[PDB]
Design goal:
Blueprint (H helix, E strand, L loop, with lengths): L6 E12 L2 E12 L2 H21 L7 E3 L3 E4 L15 E11 L5 H7 L10 E2 L6 E3 L3 H21 L4 E6 L3 E6 L2 E15 L1
Antiparallel strand pairs: 1-10, 2-5, 2-6, 2-7, 3-5, 4-5, 8-10, 9-10
InterPro entries: 26kDa_periplasmic_antigen, SIMPL/DUF541, UCP029033
Protein name: SIMPL domain-containing protein
Organism: Campylobacter jejuni
């Protein structure tokens, strides 16, 4: 004959949420034969970048700044060699950390405007972070939802044989909407 029967159902919980944290590092660099002048040009770059960031809606207290990293190459432009350069190169980093995640898009689209001033910015897309830092806080209720959805398909009637739960996934909604995240989990329940 047959020795047992069971039914398995996958329940789905899916939610779009708004990222609550944007981390946006803006690197900029200068070279100079004179180190004091290198620092003066980086400081003017810094002031100009901050003024641009505030025009874009960033507040002072969202902008962090570590000491610039200077490299002494021991070079001189007077030297007639194929690799002559300025003695010093320095790189600085204005690190934006803000809950105002919807600003990122306009900062990135407009930061090219600072070429005016001779500013050379580098923004690495790999290091721009849009995070939903409440991710772990929300998982319990979405697991419960997915498990309840599974139970209701199963009703739609013995005990449970095996229950399991995938890992959560978290994806950008759109290519052009990185501040909205789509969170998903699937709970698999098997009943007799």
């Amino acid at each position: 004959k047959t020795l047992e029967r069971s039914v398995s159902v996958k329940g789905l919980s899916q939610k779009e949420v708004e990222a609550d944290t944007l981390i946006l590092p803006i690197k900029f660099t200068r070279s100079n034969n004179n180190l004091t002048n290198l620092y003066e040009e980086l400081e003017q770059d810094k002031e100009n970048i901050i003024k641009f960031l505030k025009e874009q809606g960033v507040k002072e207290d969202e902008i962090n700044y570590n000491s610039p990293n200077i490299i002494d190459r021991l070079s001189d432009p007077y030297s007639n060699d194929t690799q002559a350069a300025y003695r010093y190169i320095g790189t600085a980093n204005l690190l934006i950390y803000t809950q105002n995640v919807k600003l990122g898009k306009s900062i990135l689209e407009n930061i090219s405007s600072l070429a005016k001033f001779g500013i050379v910015t580098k923004i690495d897309d790999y290091d721009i972070e849009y995070l939903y830092t409440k991710l772990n806080e929300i998982k319990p209720q979405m697991i419960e939802e997915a498990t309840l959805n599974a139970r209701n398909a199963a009703i739609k009637l013995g005990k449970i044989k095996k229950a399991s739960q995938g890992q959560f996934s978290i994806n950008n909604r759109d290519k052009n909407t990185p501040y909205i995240k789509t969170i998903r989990v699937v709970s698999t329940i098997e009943y007799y």
